[PDB]
Structures are given as C-alpha cells and as structure tokens.
Amino acid sequence: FLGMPAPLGYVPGLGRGATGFTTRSDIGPARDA
Amino acid sequence: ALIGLMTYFREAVVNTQELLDLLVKCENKIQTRIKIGLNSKMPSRFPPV
Amino acid sequence: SYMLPHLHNGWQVDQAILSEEDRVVVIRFGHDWDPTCMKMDEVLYSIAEKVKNFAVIYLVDITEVPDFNKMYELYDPCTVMFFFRNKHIMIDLGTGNNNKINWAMEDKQEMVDIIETVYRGARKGRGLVVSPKDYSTKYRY
Amino acid sequence: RSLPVEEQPKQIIVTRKGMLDPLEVHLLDFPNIVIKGSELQLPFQACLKVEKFGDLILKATEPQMVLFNLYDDWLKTISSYTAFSRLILILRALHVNNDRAKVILKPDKTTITEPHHIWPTLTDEEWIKVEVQLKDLILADYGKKNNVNVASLTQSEIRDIILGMEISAPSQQRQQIA
Amino acid sequence: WDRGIPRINTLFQKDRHTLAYDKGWRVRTDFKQYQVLKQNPFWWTHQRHDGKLWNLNNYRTDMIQALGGVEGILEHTLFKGTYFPTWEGLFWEKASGFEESMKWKKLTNAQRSGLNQIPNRRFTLWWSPTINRANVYVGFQVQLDL
Amino acid sequence: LRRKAARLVAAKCTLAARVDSFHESTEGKVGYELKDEIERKFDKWQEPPPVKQVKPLPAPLDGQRKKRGGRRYRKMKERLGLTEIRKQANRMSFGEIEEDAYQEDLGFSLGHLGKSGSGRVRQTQVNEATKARISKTLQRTLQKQS
Amino acid sequence: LGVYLTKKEQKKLRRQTRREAQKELQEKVRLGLMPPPEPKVRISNLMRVLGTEAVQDPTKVEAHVRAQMAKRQKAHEEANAARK
Amino acid sequence: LPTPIENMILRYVKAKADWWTNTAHYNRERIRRGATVDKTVCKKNLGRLTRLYLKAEQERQHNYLKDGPYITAEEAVAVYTTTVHWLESRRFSPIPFPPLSYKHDTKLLILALERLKEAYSVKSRLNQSQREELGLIEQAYDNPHEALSRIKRHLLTQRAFKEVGIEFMDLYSHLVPVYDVEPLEKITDAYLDQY
Amino acid sequence: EYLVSPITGEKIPASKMQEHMRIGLLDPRWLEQRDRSIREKQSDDEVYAPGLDIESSLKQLAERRTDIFGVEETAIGKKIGPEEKVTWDGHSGSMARTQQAAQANIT
Amino acid sequence: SERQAEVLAEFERRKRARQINVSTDDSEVKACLRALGEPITLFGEGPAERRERLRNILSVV
Amino acid sequence: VDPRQTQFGRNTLMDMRLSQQTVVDPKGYLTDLNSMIPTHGGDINDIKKARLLLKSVRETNPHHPPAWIASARLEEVTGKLQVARNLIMKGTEMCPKSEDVWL
RNA sequence: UUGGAACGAUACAGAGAAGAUUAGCAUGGCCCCUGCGCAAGGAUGACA
RNA sequence: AGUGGGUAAGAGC
C-alpha cells in the first residue's frame, strides 16, 4: 500500500520468504558469519 | 546476393582485390552469425561441412 | 520515470509484491537520475498501459531503499525484477545472469515480449522462463 | 472414355492398393479425376457370391461387359446414401456367412426375388428388421472369431467392424513410451 | 543449350508467344525497386526473357565430391543414428504439422518469434554428431540429467 | 473541411432566399438564426477530438475455450487447411539435388512438386477451395465503379 | 392518426422480437422446462449428424430423419391451416 | 491553453526538434561510414529521416505552388519545339488510344497481370491488402473484357485518385522511395505501361 | 396532439412523439453493455501515480540532476550543490541475526 | 421442490416484465413511481434504469 | 520452335462402350481407327515412375499400341527424343497391324 | 549430549514440448423460393 | 592471449 510507513522491527528481506542469489563473488559485500 | 554480384560483376571481381576481401569478410560474418545462433560461444575448430 | 508509481521503503515493496495475485510485478531497481534508468523508465512508461492487464510497474530507488541491495545484488546502474505470487522469476536472457535484466533495452516490443513470456511461464508454475529473443549478442553490425 | 463428360467420375476409390499405380497411368488424360485408396476393406469381392453373378460369369464363354442396378428399387423411398449403407451392410453379411445371410435375406416365403433385379423386394419395416438381423449376424460372427461379446463392442467399434477395422499388436513392448 | 546470352532455352520456353509482346522489360525490372519493398539482386536481367545465365550444377557436384560425398556428409550427421537402410528413398518436411498449422492462429509477437526458431532446432539436431563435439567447443562437458 | 462547409452554407443561403424573396425578417432575424447555427456546425466540425482510452493488451490465454463447429467451421477449415499441392510443396527430396529454377530468389523451391520420386504419376491438381477472391466491400465498390 | 415507422425501425423491432424469443427459448432450456433442441437433420445432414449410427441400421435412420423432416413440414402446414 | 503555457510548449518543441534533427543527421552519417549499429537504431533513424524528407517535400511543393512553375515560357517553347522537330523528322505516328477491337488487347493485360502477380511469387503469408490485390488480379483474369472496359473507363474519365503511401528503403547510403498504389489503379497503370 | 405508438399501441402526444420512438425500441442489451462498460471502467487500477507523486518525483530528480536544474553544477548524482541500516543477505543462516538486529533497531 | 417452483415463478415474472407497457415520458414515469411509493432515483440511476425499475415494480404488483 | 522465331522473335484407348425390363445390359465393343491424344505436356509429375510403369505395360502388353504411344510421348515431352524414336520403332516391330504406331 | 551449513543435501521427479484444442446443430447476414396471415391495391370475366 | 556470454525449474525431508 502506498503512503504507509514500515512496521517497527521488520526486515523487508524477510516477511516474504524471499531468497537472494550470487551471480559471482566480485559483486556484493563480503558475507559475514 | 552473392550470385547476383558474381554473375553481374564476373571478370570484374578478379581485378578488385578489395572486393575479394569484402566477400570473404562477409562470408565469415555470415558463418559467425550462424555459429552464434547455434551456441553462444565461438567454436575453435568448426568444420565447413 | 516520474509518471510511474514509486515505492519509498522496503515494506511497501513487500506489500506490492504480496498484493498481486494474478499479475506479474515488474520492479525497476535503480536511480531515477541514471540515464540507463531513464531509458528503462521511458520504455516502461510507454508500455505501462499496454500490459496493464497482466502486469504492473513499480519504481524503487535503491538509495532510499537499499534493503535488497545485498540480497538481490542491486549494484548495476539499472536492474529489472519480475515477480509472480511472491516468487522471483528468472529469465534465460542468454547473458549468463538469469536473475535480472541489468541492461537497458531500447525496443519496447522486446520488453513487452519479455513480460508476456514471464507471465506465461510463471502462470504455468515454472520459475525460470526462456526469453523469446536471445541477448548474448547486441546484433550490432 | 465411353461415358460423356457430365457422367464421368471425379473420385475413383479402389479397395485394393494395387490399382493406385496402374489407374494413374491409364487415367493420364484425366487429371481432374482424383484416385483414392481405401484402408477400410469394403466387401465388394463377395458380390460375386450372389447366385445371380457367379453362374452368369462362369457360363460366359467370351469376355464382355454387363450393367446391373444394385439398388433395385430402394431409391424410390430412401436416399442413395441410405441405399449405399444398406448395400454395404448386406455385402458385409454375405462375405461373413453367405449361408445364414441368405436365410436372413428372405424372412418369409412371400418375399420373392423377381428376375428383373437381384435383391428381394421387402417392406420398409421388413427391411429394417433384416438390416438389424444382419448386423447381429456380423457382430456375432466377429465375436466368434475374436472371443468378444456383442455388447462389449461400442457404436464406433461396431461401425469399424462393419467397415472392416481390425486390432492387432505382435510387439506391445512399445508400451515403454508410457 | 545454355550458351547464347538470350539463352536458347528461351526459344523453347512455354510462354514464348506471350513474352514477345512484353517490351521494355529491363527498364521495368530496374524501376521495380520503387514499387517493391525488397531490393532485387537481379535488377538487370529477367529469367523468362533472358534465360538462366549461370549453372550451379557443376559447382554443387564438385562441392559434394570435395566433402567426401553423401556418405561422409551423413557421417557428420545423425543419419546413421536413424538406422535408415539407404539414403535414396527419403524426403524432408520443411514444417511440422503443428508448426504449419501454427503459421496463422492469431499469435502474439513473442509466441511467433519463438515459433520461428523450430527449423533451427531441427537443423542443430541434424548436425549434432558434428556440432556437439569436444574439439569444436573446448571446455568442460556436462551430461544431461537422464 | 471546405467542400462540406460550402454545401451547408448553400443550403442555409437557399433558406435566406426563400425568406428574402417573400420579404420577411427585413431586420435579418432569420439571418442571425441561420448564421448562429452555421457557426455552431463549423465549431462542431472543428471541435477537438474527445478523450479516448487505449485498450490494454489482452492477457495470454490458457486452458480451453469452447468454439463451435458446423458449416462455417467446415468452410474456414477448408479455406485454411493444407492442400494436396501445398502438402507436396514442402516435401523436399533427400540426396537428390534440384537446380534452383528461381533466379530472383534461391530460397524458394517447389520441393517434391514437379520433382522426380514425388509418388505422383499424374500432376497434382489445384484445390479451387483456395481460390483468391475479393472482399464483400470490394465487390460493392467495383459494382459502384461499373 | 396512425403513424408509420421507417424501415430501420421495422428491422430493429423485428430483430429485437426475434432475439427476445430466442433468449426466452434458451432460458427455458436453462431451467429444464424445455428439452434441449435436437439437431435439424435432412438427407444431406444425415451422415454428418448420425454418421456413426447410420451404419448400424441405415433404414431406421432414414425413417427417423424423414419423420423429423415431415414433422417440421406438417407443423408448418398446420400453422398455416390454423391461421387460415 | 494559456498563452504562457503555449509558449513553454513551443520552446520545448523547438528544442526537441533541434535535438531530433541533429540526432538524425548524426546517426545517418555514422551509419553511412560503416559504423557498427543496432537494428532498432536503424529503424528509428529511418523513421526520423522519412519524416524529415517528407517535411522537406511539403516545403518544396508549397514553394512550387506559391512561386509558380520554375520553367519559363521561352524555355518550355524551346523544349517543345525541339521535341516536335525530332518527332516530325522521325516520321513518328502518335500512339492511339487502345481500341475496343485491339488485336493485342488481351496479351498486354495478361502480361500486366503476370508482372503484378510476381510481387507475391514467394510470399508465404498474405495480409488483407495482398489478398485483396490478388483477388482483384484473379477477377480481372477471369473476365478480361470487363477488366479492359474498366481500364478504358478509368483512362477516359478518372482524373482524381486515392492516396498513395510512401515508404523508404534504407541502403545506408541513400533512402530509395517505394510507393504503394491501390490495386484497382495498379492494374490500369500496369496495362497502360505494357501497351 | 395524440398519436398511437406503432410498437406500443398507446395514445401519446406528438410533441414527444419522435423521442417516444427513440427510447421506445431501445435494446436492453444496450443497458447491459453500458453496465459492463461502467463496471470495467470502475475495475481499472491507477497505472500512473497522482499529481503529488509526480511533482515530488520531479523535485527529487531535480535535486540530483544538477546538470539540468539548479544553479550549482555538481556531479551526476550528488545532492550538494550515526545510524546505518542493516540488510539481510538472503541467506537463511543469517535470518536470526537480521531479526535480532531489527529488534535492536526498535525505539 | 421449492427450487423449481421459485425459479419458474421468476421465469414467468420476467416474461410478464417483457410484456408490460411503460411510458417514455420521464415526468410521467416520475409521477407514476411517486404514486407507487418508491423513490424516483436509486443512487443516481439513469433514466433507462428508472424505467426498468418502474416496469419491474408494475410486474410485481 | 516456330520457324518464325529468331534471336529476338498420351495413354489412349481403342475400346468404347455405348450407353443405351431385364437385369443384364450388355454393351457392344466399339473400335476407333485413330486414337491420338495431343501432347498434353506437364501432366506427368514423376517422370521416372511413369517411365517405369509404361515399360512394365510394354512388357506385359506388347500388342497394345496405346502403351507404345504413351511411352514415346512421355519420352518426347521429357526431351529424350531419341529413346522415343527407339520405342516407337520397337512398337512397330511389335505391332505391325495398328497404323497408329506408324503414324 | 553438543555444532558448521541451509543460494546447501540427497530421495522422489523430470515433455525444460506445445497449445485457450475439435466435431455437430441452430441462430446471425444477404439473396431468393413457397405457404398462411395482415395492410391495402390493381387488371380482368360473366345472360333473361 | 584470455575470462565469461554453459545456473533446468519444482516437492517437502
């Protein structure tokens, strides 16, 4: 919905079941354990 | 295109070495386009058959 | 660009992806001031109304919404993402990066074909769709 | 060539596949006359089994040509499509048995075959009854040679049997397609 | 037979009577570029009026001969993989039943564009034992799933 | 917009005469009552076109849609169906090379049509169900222009 | 005074009445008050409608299709006679 | 529209038009040199060049109409007198109108129809325009006398014609005009050319 | 006046006569078509943003594209002339870490 | 059962509706609807919708 | 070719059958002195198959003048005008009674 | 008992093909034809 | 000379 703020303590990467990808290792910051 | 050019300009190709170079270049262009169509990678030892 | 709707935070992007049940969501990740992003914006706006039936267009500024940059590799000047029923759809464009359209396409017919092929493939339950036109070569001659 | 242009045929259908080559050779002057092969076996070789034909050709001491009207008078009350269907059913029955078929041809001694034509003259309902009896004959005899019940066959299957379809499979291992 | 510039075959052409009243055909052929959207490579001669001025029979004969003949050419192909007893009584089919039936069924641009590549797929399959070879495409080989 | 305008004016002019010849509205009240409607018609003809929404492209179709059969379906199937000569056209003989009879384009061939080994001793006739004919409106225009 | 109507209005009125009657019959079939219409079969239409079954017993099929044709014809004639 | 808004739009249109013209006349010259260009780029440039050429043609026709013919009376008289002298010196007989009893009235029509039909000798698919053209050709071929009568009527009476479309084949060195004429007039023109 | 409707058979005045005809034979499927037209019109969704959004987007673009706007010409994407947001990397292993980071982000 | 009865009742109700004459005058239709006791306009309905509503009301009564 | 021109300008039969309270309707055989179908070129699609079939007819029915005539005309329309002459000469040596072969 | 990994790991699965597929009848359009009805209307035949 | 332009998607364990 447009014009509505995000809920507090919500990860937009989460809350959808989304999963990223890595086309290569040269792009993106180093993954931290 | 090739038969039109060669039949129209026969006896005139032999003295136009630039035309021979252009002809072989365009033929290589056609072959490269077909090879790219087959696979998205240039063959190393592609056969003429 | 400015004509298309804009999403300001990642939660709005999540809501936009979730709220579409029968249309493919096409999101342009980039900066409105980027010339390549400008080409994507103008093409999308040109075909924002033609494909309204089976698609929807949203614009997200990754500077104000960096929440996906790590996960979606949102570092190219302009990227295009396709989603169907909260599921990112891959396109075998032929460039080796099936996840997104990271380059600017001049022809709006090509983008309409891409959107339609994505809709057809994802409606059938598939997650990766083969692009109608190969893009491993720009065909410049 | 003998017939006039108006009555000349436009489709020539041959039950056997051996006529596909020769006819086209001898019909080389008639290009608008298409020739059709027939995968289904119309029982026309059994029409000589009629008592009016075998005797006539066996005592014919010289080659000649004769004309008959296989639809004796049925065309007065039924269309030629129905006449052809009834004729092909009758020939199927004749090729099947040739003995019980003859019995079914005459249901009563009243039905008398006049010398003018070949098939016996019957009433319309009598024709219906003879047709259904001949259909039962054909289905029962097919079941006799295939160990299949008459009721087991379906409408399309019965039509195929009357036309002459068969089912066989010496190599069923192509079931590996599934 | 195929020597004179107005090829002798034109004397024996079927429509040799109605062609005699076709005058100024070279000029019409040259000016045809202003009516048809496609450029004509043979803008200068007419096959009917002037005949065929070039024969490719010998060229194709020697091209088949140079490639080792039908046997070698088919060795490069999947022909022996079809287990066809000989190459004589065979024919091709340019389009499939569904491919030909789909040439006009009110399709979209993407659908027809994808459909236009079926003959390319048949062509690649026909030349698989040669194109899909290690020497031509160096690099790692991947087996299919099944 | 000129010719049409003239007609309109002429008509109204006639009315004015049919009034002026009988000496009515000498002040010109009928004149104004006609000139205002002439201006109204001119404005309507010159009015900016209205706002017309564009039709979004229909979504791709899936599943099955029931389409009827019958005489129209039979006729359309006959018109768009594969003909015997067309079916024989796209059959290309394996191995036996044919000389290209079309100088203007080497990409066109008849296939088995006219080629040896086609399996047809006689010539394949023309299916007249595929005859080329004009539209109904073209027939109407031709009849008008006759 | 009685007023006429233009040919356009006549055509539109006839078309509207015919469409109304057709919709009425179709919705009567929808609600089960009317059996679904049978295909209209003539001699030419015979092998197209009853082709798979005319081979079973052609004479009965001929009788049935002729009975249907005669039923339509006699319905037309009796409508004319009642209108007389 | 308000006057300041109209001025805004006019200035924007002028700037966009200058950019459009410069871009067209830059891309065309890049393509002529043999530079490597995309396919959509060529189509867009061809469209821009067609629009520019048609604007130039509109200006040229308007200038011709406003300033009158550029050929003077005396030059025209000299040209016509030269042609008359040549024709008289060659004992040339003017071409007669095609008579109703012409011996070759049919061969010319057949040749014209063949020339018109050769446009689709390879076209596997036909749109509505092509199928209408083929239908007209076949209808004229089935009834040659009616076609000839229509041709004569059009020659004798027809002076106004329908709009003919224009397209441009891009040879990357020049833009060749291609003209689209209605089939009804096309058959008449083809027969006239053959005769 | 008084005229009888040729399609209705009722005494109707002549002043409305022609109009009585026009809305006399009006086909109800025209009403159906108008209803479906208004329903599909109300079934549309705003493909483009309203005026406020377009104005704000143009303001944002102008604040960044100083080569087209403004007085001071900075680079292509610079506005001129504490807390750093944490974002999930798309790995399920780091889901818990991102969740607790977001929880700590609370006010 | 009651389902066939009710659907048939609505069937002949619609059939009666198709065969009822309603004046084309908007003023007379408004007066008739007011006499019947129903509001003239239903949430900004069009005149054709008003005529249809009057026809249905007459059919029911 | 027509001599006016300069650089710039089949399988017949012999038996016919007439068509007119019995069941047998015999038709008397009718013979014709001549049976000459025109060249009618272009009606033969498979030249080789037709040539093989006509050779088979000649082998099976050596005394059938239409067989020789059709084979020769097929060779002629093919262009092999010498094998047509040879075939006709063989037919004349095989069918001396029918004058159509000699014509 | 106690951790790496999870964009991973096998098992199952694999047509990653391609389609809104095709038969019948009626309605619908034009043109007739025929019958009845309606509105009218014409020409014509018949003594004491 | 050279990297690539060569990720099948899916189901939960």
Side-chain angles (χ1 to χ4, degrees), chain E residues 6-142:
Chain E
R7 291 268 192 250
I8 309 294
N9 322 315
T10 59
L11 281 73
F12 297 79
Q13 269 190 173
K14 173 67 72 177
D15 48 4
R16 72 210 202 278
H17 44 284
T18 194
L19 273 182
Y21 311 106
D22 191 15
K23 304 301 204 172
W25 43 274
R26 289 206 197 281
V27 186
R28 248 191 297 279
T29 304
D30 192 288
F31 265 74
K32 226 69 187 176
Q33 58 155 345
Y34 303 96
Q35 294 134 20
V36 298
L37 277 296
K38 55 192 304 179
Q39 295 297 125
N40 180 18
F42 292 83
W43 51 268
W44 53 283
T45 197
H46 207 260
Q47 185 162 23
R48 313 303 316 154
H49 278 290
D50 209 2
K52 190 168 193 171
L53 282 182
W54 45 274
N55 219 12
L56 287 182
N57 195 48
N58 289 293
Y59 168 84
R60 277 160 179 166
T61 295
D62 289 343
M63 181 155 68
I64 297 185
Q65 177 59 249
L67 281 160
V70 163
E71 55 186 359
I73 294 178
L74 297 191
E75 176 82 2
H76 281 267
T77 74
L78 263 179
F79 167 76
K80 220 167 294 295
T82 52
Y83 202 42
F84 274 131
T86 196
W87 59 272
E88 291 164 66
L90 276 71
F91 64 83
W92 290 98
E93 195 173 4
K94 290 183 224 206
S96 169
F98 85 105
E99 169 186 355
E100 190 277 331
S101 82
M102 262 295 188
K103 293 171 73 71
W104 59 88
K105 263 182 72 74
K106 197 204 157 189
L107 312 179
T108 58
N109 301 73
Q111 213 156 1
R112 179 179 293 268
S113 66
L115 185 134
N116 297 338
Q117 295 150 358
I118 304 311
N120 296 348
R121 289 157 57 160
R122 314 188 299 105
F123 177 83
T124 63
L125 184 53
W126 166 250
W127 292 101
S128 299
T130 291
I131 297 169
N132 204 7
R133 194 162 78 261
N135 291 107
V136 293
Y137 283 94
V138 292
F140 66 109
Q141 56 199 10
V142 181

Side-chain angles (χ1 to χ4, degrees), chain F:
Chain F
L1 216 52
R2 270 208 169 84
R3 283 280 184 84
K4 170 162 88 163
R7 295 179 307 199
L8 178 67
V9 182
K12 303 318 159 179
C13 282
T14 313
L15 312 188
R18 279 156 184 180
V19 178
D20 290 315
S21 52
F22 303 72
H23 294 88
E24 310 296 334
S25 163
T26 57
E27 312 94 5
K29 304 324 278 176
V30 177
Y32 313 129
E33 191 214 353
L34 285 168
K35 192 55 169 296
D36 67 351
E37 82 164 356
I38 284 175
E39 296 286 341
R40 181 52 251 188
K41 299 296 182 190
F42 286 162
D43 295 348
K44 172 74 57 66
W45 301 345
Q46 272 171 327
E47 87 190 318
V51 183
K52 305 153 181 185
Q53 66 270 14
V54 64
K55 204 196 52 188
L57 186 71
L61 300 170
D62 193 2
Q64 286 189 357
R65 197 257 318 167
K66 306 304 181 229
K67 49 177 183 178
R68 82 188 51 79
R71 55 175 328 273
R72 182 194 201 171
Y73 173 82
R74 270 192 303 278
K75 194 57 68 170
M76 293 177 71
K77 187 168 91 157
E78 288 144 3
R79 197 158 321 286
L80 288 188
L82 188 43
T83 318
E84 183 41 56
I85 179 162
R86 220 176 82 208
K87 200 170 311 172
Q88 200 181 166
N90 75 332
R91 283 207 266 258
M92 182 179 72
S93 178
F94 191 97
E96 296 317 303
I97 306 300
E98 57 177 0
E99 178 72 72
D100 283 346
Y102 205 52
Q103 203 198 40
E104 199 207 333
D105 179 22
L106 295 175
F108 172 71
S109 68
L110 315 169
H112 265 295
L113 186 64
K115 201 175 183 180
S116 186
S118 73
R120 325 275 286 177
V121 179
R122 279 189 309 164
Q123 184 61 256
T124 303
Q125 278 305 111
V126 188
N127 182 13
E128 297 305 319
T130 72
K131 210 188 175 37
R133 39 179 177 171
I134 50 186
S135 175
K136 197 173 62 189
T137 52
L138 210 50
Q139 278 152 13
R140 183 218 169 106
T141 55
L142 265 293
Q143 294 302 331
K144 294 298 302 305
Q145 195 61 254
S146 292

Side-chain angles (χ1 to χ4, degrees), chain K residues 9 36-37 44 49-50 61 99:
Chain K
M36 172 175 88
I37 308 310
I44 288 156
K49 187 181 184 52
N61 295 327
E99 73 257 18

